[PDB]
Write a protein that binds this ligand. Structure first.
Ligand SMILES: [Mg+2]
Length: 1064
């Protein structure tokens, strides 16, 4: 319960471990100390009886070495994780990994290991098995969440009822390797040495040590323990322990041994002509999800039954097999039952609805996890190659728990050289040789920047029609690119979502030169990515995007000139691009607009709050703004303000949202059940965000796309910010921070704080001056901060490392957070002849995994910023800001940003919900916001529908089938991914693709709803909407529990409600 690791009190640095080893011998029992640490010293004892006796002697205060007293304090983190309970440390056991081969009582002994040291750790929730395969030692650790079922087994004779203990895993263990340095053993106390049993060496994560790779291809661990008197262990401490002991007999698992370093959990080549894109992937998906066993899919019966039957029914039956949460030990029986009890548009929907059925694969450190076809937003590559959409595969590299791969897993990081571990080599080998799910071999083609951040890789099966290399030829990569950075940029440019604007003539594209100052040594270009566009081209681009207004600037990727282009009414050339926007060469002379300039609501971040506090904004100022935010959030369940205060701006909802529709012209949020539940979900999301990432909205502030003034009027330290006034801002206008330009928009006149999204170094917070230019009408910039054309240094450049390639700048006129003084900024300062190879791109991906994520670097900066007197100007914080800049620049220079141990957060703020880390209270630097958030958190309508929304007699009742079909589809989606009882598009938002899986059934319902409507439409569309409302609300006692079927036609329902209210 304490791990016997006692944090020693103040001790001198001139202390010998052998001295304390022998001194403790004269004070406690003989050889009764396990481990010892001296840098805040730690001593681990053998048991909890020898511990609490030193504490008893510590309370007696007798122990005093030399002239220094010892105050043995509370138990800190374990020096070496060992089970203090003598019984929990099981040694010399027989461990066999396998799967139940679809019988629930027979086990595939894939590989048997003898001498396994099973350490069942409760405080640190993990059971670590120490194996000794070959000549090296490996540790197999389950995580107490891997175990979905622990069973009491009887593998040998029935004389002993309890002989083995099964450990059914759902994610798969993390395998480590015993690697030593053979260095001097003393090192005073040393970190892992001084142990009684010589627990030296390091534990680096590696792959399946078994030649047969039995660890990966096994979903269960069997622990043949010598004694069955261990009921107390392997009990409710191990999750899901049934008391019903099962008789388990071993079977030969030699037929499932695969030596392939890729995809160790797939079916063998025992298929004649079976289609792998629709069964083998789905069968392997079932095996990985453990819905059926590996022998359940490799058996002749199921293979022959699926081969004989139709493919569409096969997809349906395999999906239904994947539906149930238990392990189907009789997939043949399930398939036969669904066959006998069968109860009897087009795949190219991405060309129209921009949604693909992608077959993603999470490649863990030692296992493959195929996840079948899943609906996500389509990208340009599949948009072009929809003929082979089933040949794509979104390969993601995870850490055996569907979590992000740690840098420690892929790199060792007391070491002389950063030697990459076996996980990095495995990822490189998989990216090279590809994933082979049967006949289809998925080999790497390219990845996106977000995919790089998400550790996701696309792989194409080399179909006979088009090879996986020809698509790379289409995308323009690996053709003539010379640098890995620009190769990755070109690869990612064709994956990010965008809108295809008008095709632009190459002759109409002017090339206006860049603006560079080149002062103070650094070469700084003012027009780093900002271009131009004519007003006519702007209007046609706007209507191409889908807007009725002309945005000030568009973030574009036209050809290779990636950047943002502003609307100049003086400009007559169509596109007037620049050289500084060039990233790669491309003949695709057509605009690809990602996002335009809109007045996106502002919201602070923990990094922005940290820097503003460091520059001199008191914590009592942020707390007041968060108090206003929490006041706005508390009454959203009880006031109509949520229509234009929470959903409109705090969340991603807009004027076309259904909740906004029924709140702008509807009743209170708590009146309607669907409205109340969706508003409660939004409330939970906003509170969780504000508690995690302090998105404190500033009404006097807007996050705006950076832009440059194309005329020389704006000077250094001066910016132009003309923003369309919000409704609340329209109500309270004509202030010192604004002046009326039009009936709708106003330009800031006062001081403005400007910083980029990362915003980690004190100095990116720039207190610029918002000035009104007499040329506001001539150029008409809107919802975009206008950086000066000339000056000592470009303002986005001194905003950390920002530039006008579409980077959004945090701009707020709110005087409360505007610093009195601004810190002077950081400096923010190779075409190898070997060209770009596929292996080089794989190495770039691997090294990006080596580099620590921007999120963890920002979190560590927060940790080191919440205690130091200089919050962000601290040496730790400045060095880690430089490291964060290196991590951002990794997309340009492939040097991983390995955060050192000195910069690692030893103890984490209470604001960050890091339960594994040792938390310290953070009442110093705006940690009061978390406490305020917690304090704020811890402070049918059928008749109404039939009256004010269903006045016209519908009497259709055709929506009952939809409620039994679309409701069935929603229940299927909830069973597949969801966990709550929500039936709306936010079902998975408790979410990356749940809004895509959902809102498609509603889109299917919308198609189904109009299909059942014969159109006028008052007798068809309104009738169907009223029938759905009556089916859901009036018969809510039925077995539907949806409350969202009428919301699929919710626009029509709200229109009918307004029409009935208009007639009244
Ligand atoms: Mg940028």
């Amino acid at each position: 319960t304490n791990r016997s690791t006692v944090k020693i009190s103040n001790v001198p640095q001139t202390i010998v471990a052998d001295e304390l080893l022998r001194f403790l011998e004269l004070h406690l029992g003989e050889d009764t100390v396990f481990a010892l640490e001296i840098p805040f010293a730690r001593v681990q004892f053998t048991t909890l009886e020898v511990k609490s006796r030193a504490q008893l002697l510590s309370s007696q205060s007798k122990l005093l070495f030399k002239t220094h007293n010892l105050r043995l304090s509370e138990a800190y983190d374990d020096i070496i994780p060992r089970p203090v309970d003598p019984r929990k440390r099981l040694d010399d056991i027989v461990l066999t990994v396998g799967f139940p081969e679809s019988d629930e009582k027979r086990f595939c002994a894939l590989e048997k290991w003898d001498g396994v040291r099973c350490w069942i750790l409760t405080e640190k929730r993990r059971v670590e098995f120490w194996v000794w395969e070959s000549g090296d030692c490996y540790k197999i650790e389950v995580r107490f969440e891997d175990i979905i079922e622990t069973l009491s087994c009887c593998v040998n004779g029935d004389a002993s009822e309890i002989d083995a203990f099964l450990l059914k895993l759902k994610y798969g263990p993390k395998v480590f390797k015993r690697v030593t340095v053979h260095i001097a053993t003393k090192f005073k106390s040393d970190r892992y040495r001084f142990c009684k049993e010589d627990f030296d060496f390091m534990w680096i994560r590696t792959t399946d040590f078994s030649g047969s790779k039995s660890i990966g291809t096994s979903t269960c661990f069997c622990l043949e323990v010598h004694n069955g008197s261990t009921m107390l262990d392997i009990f409710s401490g191990l999750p899901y322990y049934r008391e019903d002991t099962l008789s388990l007999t071993y079977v030969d698992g030699k037929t499932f041994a695969s030596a392939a370093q890729i995809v160790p959990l797939l079916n063998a080549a025992i298929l004649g002509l079976e289609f792998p894109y629709e069964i083998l992937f789905q069968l392997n998906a079932l095996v990985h999800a453990q819905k059926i066993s590996l022998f359940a899919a490799s058996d002749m019966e199921l293979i022959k039954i699926l081969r004989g039957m139709s493919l569409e029914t096969a997809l349906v039956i395999l999906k239904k097999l994947h539906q149930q949460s238990s392990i189907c030990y009789d997939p043949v029986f399930f398939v036969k039952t669904q066959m006998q009890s069968v109860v009897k548009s087009a795949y190219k929907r991405l060309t129209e609805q921009n949604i693909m059925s992608c077959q993603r694969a999470y490649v863990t450190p030692s296992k493959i996890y195929l996840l079948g076809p899943e609906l996500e937003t389509a990208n340009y590559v599949v948009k072009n190659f929809a003929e082979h959409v089933s040949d794509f595969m979104r390969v993601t590299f995870v850490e055996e728990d569907w979590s992000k791969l740690p840098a420690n897993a892929l790199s060792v990081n007391g070491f002389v050289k950063p030697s990459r571990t076996n996980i990095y080599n495995r990822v490189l080998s998989i990216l090279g040789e590809g994933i082979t799910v049967g006949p289809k071999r998925f080999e790497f083609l390219a990845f996106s920047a977000s995919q790089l951040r998400g550790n996701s890789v696309w792989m194409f099966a080399s179909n006979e029609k088009v090879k996986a290399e020809d698509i790379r030829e289409w995308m323009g990569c690996f053709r003539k690119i010379r640098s890995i950075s620009k190769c990755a940029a070109r690869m990612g440019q064709l994956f990010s979502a965008s809108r295809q604007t008008l095709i632009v003539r190459a002759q109409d594209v002017e090339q206006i030169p860049d603006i560079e100052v080149t002062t103070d040594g650094a070469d700084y270009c003012f027009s780093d990515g900002i271009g131009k566009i004519s007003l006519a081209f702007a209007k046609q681009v706007a209507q191409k995007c889908g807007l009725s207004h002309v945005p000030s600037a568009f973030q574009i990727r036209y050809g290779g000139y990636k950047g943002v282009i502003a609307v100049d009414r003086s400009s007559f050339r169509k596109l007037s691009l620049r050289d500084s926007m060039l990233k790669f060469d491309s003949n695709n002379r057509m605009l690809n607009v990602t996002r335009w300039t809109e007045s996106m609501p502002c919201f602070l971040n923990r990094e922005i709050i940290c820097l503003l506090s460091t520059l001199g904004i008191e914590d009592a100022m942020f707390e007041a703004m968060q108090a206003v935010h929490l006041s706005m959030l508390g009454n959203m369940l009880e006031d109509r303000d949520a229509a234009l205060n929470v959903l409109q701006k705090l969340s991603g909802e807009n004027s076309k949202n259904l909740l906004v529709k029924m709140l702008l012209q509807g009743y209170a949020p708590s009146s309607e059940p669907y409205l109340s539940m969706m508003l409660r979900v939004h409330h939970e999301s906003q509170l969780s965000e504000l508690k995690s990432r302090c998105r404190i909205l500033v009404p006097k502030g807007r996050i705006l796309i950076g832009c440059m003034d194309e005329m020389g009027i704006l000077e250094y330290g001066q910016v132009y910010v003309r923003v369309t006034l919000t409704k609340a801002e329209l109500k309270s206008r004509d202030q010192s921070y604004f002046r009326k330009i039009d009936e709708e928009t106003s330009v800031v006149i006062g001081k403005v704080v400007v910083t980029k999204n990362p915003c980690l170094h004190p100095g990116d917070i720039r207190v610029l001056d918002a000035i009104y230019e007499v040329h506001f009408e001539e150029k008409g910039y809107l919802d975009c901060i206008i950086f000066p054309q000339k000056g000592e240094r470009p303002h986005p450049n001194e905003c950390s490392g920002g530039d006008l390639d579409g980077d959004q700048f945090f701009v707020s006129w709110d005087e409360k957070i505007i610093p009195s003084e601004m810190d002077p900024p950081m400096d923010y300062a190779r075409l190898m002849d070997h060209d770009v190879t596929l292996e080089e791109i794989h190495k770039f991906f691997v090294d990006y995994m080596i580099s620590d994520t921007l999120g963890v670097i920002s979190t560590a900066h927060l940790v080191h910023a919440d205690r130091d007197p200089e919050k962000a100007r601290s040496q730790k914080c400045l060095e880690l800001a430089n490291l964060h800049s290196r991590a951002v620049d990794f997309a340009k220079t492939g040097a991983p940003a390995e955060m050192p141990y000195a910069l690692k957060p030893r103890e984490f703020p209470d604001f960050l919900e890091r339960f594994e880390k040792p938390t310290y209270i953070s009442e110093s630097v705006f940690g009061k916001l978390y406490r305020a958030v917690k304090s704020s958190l811890a402070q049918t309508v059928a008749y109404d529908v039939t009256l004010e929304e269903a006045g016209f007699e519908s009497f259709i009742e055709t929506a009952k089938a939809h409620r039994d079909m679309y409701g069935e589809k929603l229940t299927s989606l909830m069973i597949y991914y969801g966990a709550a009882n929500e039936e709306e598009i936010l079902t998975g938002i408790l979410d990356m693709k749940d809004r895509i899986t959902l809102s498609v059934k509603d889109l299917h319902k919308e198609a189904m709803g109009w299909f059942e409507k014969s159109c006028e439409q008052q007798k068809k569309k309104l009738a169907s909407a009223w029938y759905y409302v009556t089916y859901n609300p009036n018969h809510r006692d039925e077995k539907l529990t949806f409350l969202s079927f009428p919301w699929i036609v919710g626009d029509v329902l709200l229109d009918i409600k307004a029409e009935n209210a208009q007639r009244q």
